[PDB]
């Protein structure tokens, strides 16, 4: 009697958290949605999809998770956004399945514990970057202080916009598994 599951792409807020569910294979990914800042997904022979919890705007703030994460193939644990003017997304990756993400490589940042690689890549059709900090060794619980990468993707020339949503999300491509992802604010 209360917990949601999803199956269709929208965005909206749940339980007082923002949350974004997008997939381009309908019918095999879905999304349920738990008290607070918690949601698990689960996934079958998928495409892609991304979804998650968090803030409608994003900022600087320190975060706190914890995750199970579930995946067989290819599959990231990742503190996800976006910004506009300049349209750029992000993403912290803490876990990831079969493959690591990576692309330019331009420093590492130390912060939390660990030690992460910093990345450019672009997207083509919008055209535009992605900023990454892949995590040196994989871990699913944990806090972010999510300014600390800001500041090393700026020192790098990685330049964020005016901020759009930000959330904990479990990211897809094919391949099926399972996660339950709780975030919230604080160190």
Do not use: C
Not at 22 to 39: C, E, F, I, N
Request: charged share 15%; hydrophobic share 25%; net charge positive.
């Amino acid at each position: 009697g209360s917990d949601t599951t999803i199956t269709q792409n929208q965005t909206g807020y749940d339980n007082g958290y923002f949350y974004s569910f997008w997939t381009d294979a309908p019918g095999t990914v879905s999304m349920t949605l738990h008290s607070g800042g918690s949601y698990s997904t689960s996934w079958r022979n998928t495409g892609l999809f991304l979804a998650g919890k968090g803030w409608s705007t994003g900022g600087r703030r320190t975060v706190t998770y914890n995750a199970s994460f579930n995946p067989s193939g290819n599959a990231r644990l990742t503190l996800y956004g976006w910004t506009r003017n300049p349209l750029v997304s992000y993403h912290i990756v803490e876990s990831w399945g079969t493959y690591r993400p990576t692309g330019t490589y331009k420093g590492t940042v130390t912060t939390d514990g660990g030690t992460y690689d910093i990345y450019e890549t672009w997207r083509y059709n919008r055209t535009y970057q992605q900023f990454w900090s892949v995590r040196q060794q994989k871990r699913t619980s944990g806090t972010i202080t999510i300014g600390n990468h800001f500041d090393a993707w700026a020192r790098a020339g990685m330049n964020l916009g005016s901020h759009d949503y930000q959330i904990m999300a479990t990211e897809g491509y094919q391949s099926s598994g399972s996660s339950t992802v709780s975030i919230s604010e604080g160190g």
